[PDB]
Amino acid sequence: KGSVVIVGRIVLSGKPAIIPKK
Amino acid sequence: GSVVIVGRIVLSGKPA
Amino acid sequence: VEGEVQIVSTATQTFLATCINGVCWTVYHGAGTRTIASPKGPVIQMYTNVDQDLVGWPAPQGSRSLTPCTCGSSDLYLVTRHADVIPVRRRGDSRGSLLSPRPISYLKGSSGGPLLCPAGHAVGLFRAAVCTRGVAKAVDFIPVENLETTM
Amino acid sequence: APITAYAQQTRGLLGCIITSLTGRDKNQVEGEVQIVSTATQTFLATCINGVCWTVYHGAGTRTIASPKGPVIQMYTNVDQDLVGWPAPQGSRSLTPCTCGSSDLYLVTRHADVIPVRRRGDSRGSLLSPRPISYLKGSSGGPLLCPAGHAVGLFRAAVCTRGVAKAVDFIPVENLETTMRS
Ligand SMILES: *[C@](O)(C(=O)NC1CC1)[C@H](CCCC)NC(=O)[C@@H]1[C@@H]2[C@H](CN1C(=O)[C@@H](NC(=O)NC1(CS(=O)(=O)C(C)(C)C)CCCCC1)C(C)(C)C)C2(C)C
Ligand SMILES: [Zn+2]
Ligand SMILES: [Zn+2]
């Protein structure tokens, strides 16, 4: 039987931020 | 006159 | 990445706008009946409500909508134009007290911004700072109900 | 500070399948909750106090793909419906709730946080019922208190006519008991 694989992540530690321009 | 968007804030702090 | 809060400006000032339910909301005393800029030209307001100091345009590009609060919490959080989060204790249908007062400067340019609940859901729109001698100890806000109602 | 969350997909279908067989994942890990996939389903796994926890009905007794090959489960409890592997290097752990709040917030697979009112040791009601399709994929996800500490792990939806009005969860207490056994 196969391994459980991480296909993404959910981040709770992020705080409001101004989206930087590039 | 017109209102213009000068920036944006992402509440979750998503970098992506 | 998409943003729920837009930092906006007119020739006169700078303030904020918050996208809730596919509409980009802000304070009438900031925008007026002004139109909003777009790559295809100006787009007119979908909603104007001088009475509630509320105006809304169709949500712009690069934005995502905020979900209205449904938990009735009183522990609010005001997000400023500098992305600062300020804990506010709700005192009334459209009033809340800063848990830690701040000079007016700290809250300047943030009207139109959101007041979030513990779940990050929209409770109201920051309408104006209620200050005593240059110190904001409370704030006035437009509850989401008004927005949901105006739509 | 309000509870906000964001999601990021780290790999696709084919890369997932290869990594599943290989059991070797060299991808960088970040975050408190990992979006997890077997060959049949995708759900969530929450890191709490150094252990990456998830639902047994999802992971079964499988190993977790890591940069050093597959990692055996640290804990398994078919009854509590829990499994736990060492938290991946890079992840951040949540800590158990110690304020006994009944105002909970469920973080979904899509990174939405929805309020639930604790109505029992393993149950809470959605203040705003949603179709179960929304909750699909959220098993193993966290239920947070206002302070952002872990209260439980989403287990099953209590649905009727396809709409969920309540949720069933594994309170963080069962975790300590599983480790103690
Ligand atoms: C979770 O495993 C997951 O997201 N993984 C899948 C999607 C890839 C999943 C979350 C989906 C909820 C929408 N949870 C389950 O699959 C669990 C496991 C089996 C059944 N369910 C589950 O959520 C059931 N709900 C359910 O069984 N609920 C009750 C009974 S009931 O709903 O009141 C009723 C009698 C059927 C009307 C029993 C458990 C406690 C809550 C009530 C549904 C798939 C029907 C939503 C496990 C082991 C519980
Ligand atoms: Zn709320
Ligand atoms: Zn707590």
Backbone angles phi, psi at A20, to 5 degrees: -65, 150
Residue C11 one-letter amino acid:
A
Residue D98, Cβ neighbours under 10 Å: how many?
10
Contacting partners of chain D (3+ CB pairs under 8 A):
A, B, C
Residue C130 Cα to chain centre, angstroms: 15
SS (H, E, C) chain C: CCECEEEEECCCCEEEEEEECCEEEEEHHHHCCCEECCCCCCECCCEEECCCCEEEEECCCCECCECECCCCCCEEEEECCCCCEEEEEEEECCEEEEEEEEEHHHHCCCCCCEEECCCCCEEEEEEEEEEECCEEEEEEEEEHHHHHHHC
How many residues comprise chain C?
151
Q: Which two tokens stand for residue A2?
A: 């196969």
Nearest to D108 by CA among D70, D83, D137: D137
Token pair of D6, please?
Answer: 């964001």
- Alpha carbon dihedral B16, C1, C3, C4, in 10-degree steps, equals -90
How many whole angstroms separate alpha carbon C79 and alpha carbon C76?
10
Instruction: Give the C-alpha separation, D167 to D157, whole Å.
Output: 4
Contact between residue D43 and residue D33 where contact means Cβ atoms under 8 Å apart: no
Contact A5 D92 (CB under 8 A): no
Q: Which domains does chain D have, with CATH numbers?
A: 1-94 (2.40.10.120), 95-181 (2.40.10.10)
Residue pair D102/D135 in contact (Cβ under 8 Å)? The answer is no
Q: How was this structure determined?
A: X-ray
Q: What is the torsion angle, in degrees rounded to the nearest 10, for the CA atoms of residue D139, residue D142, residue D146 and residue D150?
A: 140
The data reach a resolution, in angstroms, of 2.2
Query: Between chains, do D29 and A15 touch, taking CB under 8 Å as contact?
Result: no
Integer Cα distance of D40 and D137 in angstroms: 12
Q: Provide the sign of the torsion angle of the four alpha carbons B13, B16, C3, C6, taken in this order.
A: positive
Cα separations (Å) of C142 from A16, C27, C102, C114, D39? 21, 9, 21, 9, 48
3-state per-residue secondary structure call for chain B = CEEEEEEEEECCCCCC
> What residues have CB less than 8 Å from D181, skipping those under 6 apart?
D77
Residues of B in contact with D111 (CB under 8 A): 12
Q: How many CB atoms lie within 10 A of CB B14?
A: 20
Substitution site in D168, D169, D170, D174 for ligand 1 pocket (most atoms within 8 Å of beta carbon): D168
- What residue ranges in chain D does DSSP mark as E strands? 6-9, 33-37, 42-48, 51-55, 64-66, 69-71, 75-77, 82-86, 103-107, 113-118, 123-131, 142-144, 150-160, 163-171
| Interchain CB distance below 8 Å, C11 and B1 | yes
> Looking at beta carbons, which residues of chain C come within 8 Å of D114?
119
- State how far the Cα of C119 lies from the Cα of C61, in Å rounded to an integer: 25
Q: Is residue D84 classed as helix, strand or coil in its secondary structure? A: strand
C-alpha C133/C-alpha C140 separation (Å) is 17
Determine the residue of D36, D41, D57 to mutate for testing ligand 1's pocket, defined as the one with the most ligand atoms within 8 A of the Cβ atom: D57
- Residue D89, phi-psi category: left (phi > 0), alpha (psi -120 to 50), beta (remainder): beta
Q: Which residues of B touch D31 (CB under 8 A)?
A: none
DSSP string, D105-124: EEEPTTS-EEEEEE-SSSEE
Task: Please report which ligand is nearest the Cα atom of D144.
Answer: 3
Exposed/middle/buried for residue D161 (C-beta within 10 Å: 0-12, 13-18, 19+): exposed
Residue D132 Cβ inside 6 Å of ligand 1? The answer reads yes
Cα(D3) to ligand 3 centroid in Å equals 13
Q: Between the CA of residue C7 and those of A17, B2, C22, D91, D151, what are the distances in Å?
A: 12, 14, 17, 32, 36
The token pair that represents C116 in the structure block: 């979030």
